[PDB]
Design a protein around this ligand. Structure first.
Ligand SMILES: C[C@H](CO)CCOP(=O)(O)OP(=O)(O)O
Lengths: 227, 253, 254, 219
């Protein structure tokens, strides 16, 4: 009796044909909804509804020796000299980046990171099969999708080559929103609800990790606040 | 048996003829009912066509009031085509008031009720200090005091303390050069049109905001003065009711 | 013998039931048509009542004039409610030889034809000195000069040499103490009434003696040697064909 | 039991998801460009043939059912519940009940017009206010140069340009109707959240006489 297997064989084709057309139609809805835009109450309206609040805890085991993960496991500080500690393949050795213990395999999630009055930071989403040893350019082709501040009042998106993001305001709290299926990583100003950058049509194959890197010595810690 | 069956054939074959006559009396009634219905339909659409022709006409209405539905303070001419407000002529007199009479609003209602078509009536309000003229639904309040507004069913043009105003929201005073000699109230039921016209020159003065009535509408007048003649102009009566000498009736009063 | 005959009996019973079942459909149709005729009788009676409430009412006609019957000396405006004179304006010009043309006196006929009921209209003649206004039979002679009298089918009021006048019987001097600006013409077919009114105060001027029409009557206008145009006042249109705001519409002008 | 249950729950959830996507997806920039990139793929064209029988007697419609123009004087043509008798309105022949369609109106350089959709059961005898409550979802230009949407109360609309062409998009399932400036692809207005009842009909009205009528572009 193949009818029991026939039902699965039928639902597999109907499910494969459903999501492709749904995603194409959704992208055309995106390009159409581009007009008639405002955000006065949007951020607190749908960031708590459509995006499944997710908490990110910092993982000391991947942090560089120069980075001091705070005792609360949520904040990261910049220290003076690299303290000695074992070199696991997870651990970075050149790039100053730290990740979270959990990877979001699929779905839609978000997390809020407050940068405060910092002068150098880079937060974003990295892959799992990234090159953690040596130096590798943090481009989308290398698995990094990151927003960053540089030399005081410069804003950049780490594509290749670096592109400048001219913005009117100065963010203090940035919400990162990841949609696996739609393939969209979005950075929003959590204080007011504006828009900074969204990565469109990202071919996702592996799991995704939060990534935070800090270069300059600063007395301000990068805090990840949960839901 | 065989005998039972032959009598059965004899009786049950004896049922066809009654069915035949029932069929016949059904069909004949059907056909003459069809033709009679056709004649009725033909005359009905003839009437439809005639009415559609005779429904785009403006009718000069000879407004006659009802002295029962006026404030007891008011005074009405015996011809019932002009009214005023006398200084309490019923001082010491008892006037039983019917349920359909105004009590605190010194108004009078035209007894004729319109439900379609275009109508209009003229009012001569020379030498008055407070006059309001317009249209009211047949289902406006009577027991107490209300406000003359389009919501309550009162499309009115008012002259208050010397200023000419619309539906009596004091926020719409019109730019009117001079006083009104003769004011015409025009009414279009299928369009919610209540227009007030300057009849000295037949010039547009005001149009009320459109508001479907869905109930018959009647003329409405209110006065504030004391013994200030206001005159409802009667429709052109022609020379009916009076014998015309062959010389030709001239300058009739 | 029994077998085939009882086949026949069963067959006959076969159509007896269908004949029986064909009766209720016919009866139900007849009753439903009874209901339909009752409803249509009700609608017809309502229509008759509404048409009885009809033309006992005075009808204010929105007079539009007929260019085809206008004299070549006469000129019509774009809205077909204004007529003036201009000598030598259609001398040899392309004008058809319409049999319904006024080509003797400077006159023009209204487009409306009246057959019954009371109907009236108003004319602005303040700017002219020689005006004739009234009612005419539809069969008045047109080619040659005629006499504007009831004998020929004319009921008119006239201005001549600064004097008001009757049907042009010169024995009927009109002692009007004030000069006219707006004149009202009133018609009543049932009682044969042709009245003239002074529209400033709506008072009687002259009623022509009663004469049964029996012919579709029509308004008739005649403009003398005065280039000032005659205006026929349009009926009270109201706020028709305009956008009404929410704060009302004040002082419409077109 | 699950057959109609799916068609209820999953489609309702998809509708609410798209409604919530509207807010967060318009929170981005107003990159209103390539008006032909979405107007042909998301929405399918509709060739609007006019219906020269539901029109007011005052309106003249060309034999090709493109232009409607206010004639000089009212006509006396046979009437029926199809014919508008008071509103100067004309409807297309076809009705819409499902899917999503659109049509372009070339308003030219006129001074007064109104376009939109109306319900199947509209009151064609007498005067009825043109509001969403009755079934007339319309908008357009009045008072020469004043743009307005026919709401209760009617709402003035501030436009930075002059729309010579207006594109009307209907999406029955979402129940939202949009008017766009088809000249440059900008967005003019959009009635949201509307829950339809029966089939919808194109509508046009013009309370004035001008040398240029309301032309309708093909599908
Ligand atoms: C003559 C036009 C078109 O028929 C009708 C005007 O109706 P209004 O209600 O006054 O116009 P709008 O609703 O647009 O303010």
């Amino acid at each position: 009796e193949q009818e029991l297997r026939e039902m699965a064989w039928s639902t597999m084709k109907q499910e494969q044909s459903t999501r492709v057309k749904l995603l194409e139609e959704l992208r055309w809805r995106s390009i159409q909804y581009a007009s008639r835009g405002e955000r006065h109450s949007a951020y607190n309206e749908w960031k708590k509804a459509l995006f499944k609040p997710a908490d990110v805890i910092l993982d000391p085991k991947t942090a560089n020796p120069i980075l001091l993960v705070s005792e609360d496991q949520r904040s990261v500080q910049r220290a003076k000299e690299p303290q000695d500690l074992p070199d696991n393949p997870e651990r970075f050795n050149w790039h100053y980046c730290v990740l979270g213990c959990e990877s979001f395999i699929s779905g839609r999630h978000y997390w809020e990171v407050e940068v405060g009055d910092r002068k150098e930071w880079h937060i974003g989403v990295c892959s799992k099969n990234v090159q953690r040893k040596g130096w590798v350019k943090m481009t989308p082709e290398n698995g990094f999708w990151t927003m960053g501040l540089t030399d005081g009042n410069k804003y950049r998106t780490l594509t290749e080559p670096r592109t400048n993001l001219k913005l009117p305001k100065t963010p203090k709290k940035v919400g990162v929103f990841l949609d696996y299926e739609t393939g969209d990583i979005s950075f929003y100003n959590a204080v007011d609800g504006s828009h900074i950058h969204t990565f469109l049509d990202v071919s996702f194959s592996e799991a995704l990790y939060p990534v935070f890197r800090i270069l300059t010595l600063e007395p301000t810690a990068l805090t990840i606040c949960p839901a | 048996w065989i005998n039972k069956l032959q009598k059965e054939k004899k009786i049950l074959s004896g049922e066809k003829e009654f069915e035949r006559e029932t069929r016949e009396i059904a069909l004949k009634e059907l056909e003459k009912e069809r033709v009679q219905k056709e004649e009725e339909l033909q005359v009905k659409e003839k009437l439809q066509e005639e009415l559609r022709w005779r429904r785009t006409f403006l009718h000069a209405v000879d407004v006659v009031l009802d002295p029962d539905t006026a404030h007891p303070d008011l005074f009405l001419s015996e011809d019932r085509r002009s009214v005023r407000r006398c200084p309490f002529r019923h001082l010491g007199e008892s006037v039983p008031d019917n349920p359909e009479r105004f009590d605190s609003q010194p108004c009078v209602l035209g007894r004729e009720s319109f439900a379609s078509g275009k109508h209009y009536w003229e009012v001569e309000v020379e030498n008055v200090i407070e006059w309001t003229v317009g249209v009211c639904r047949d289902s406006v309040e009577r027991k107490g005091e209300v406000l003359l507004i389009p919501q309550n069913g009162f499309w009115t043009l008012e002259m208050h303390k010397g200023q000419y105003r619309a539906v009596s929201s004091p926020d719409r005073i019109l730019p009117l050069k001079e006083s009104l000699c003769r004011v015409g109230v025009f009414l279009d039921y299928e369009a919610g049109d209540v227009s007030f016209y300057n009849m000295r020159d037949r010039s547009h003065i005001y149009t009320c905001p459109r508001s479907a009535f869905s109930v018959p509408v009647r003329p409405f007048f209110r006065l504030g003065c004391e013994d200030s003649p206001i005159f409802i102009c009667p429709a052109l009566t022609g020379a009916n009711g009076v014998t015309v000498p062959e010389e030709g009736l001239t300058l009739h009063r």
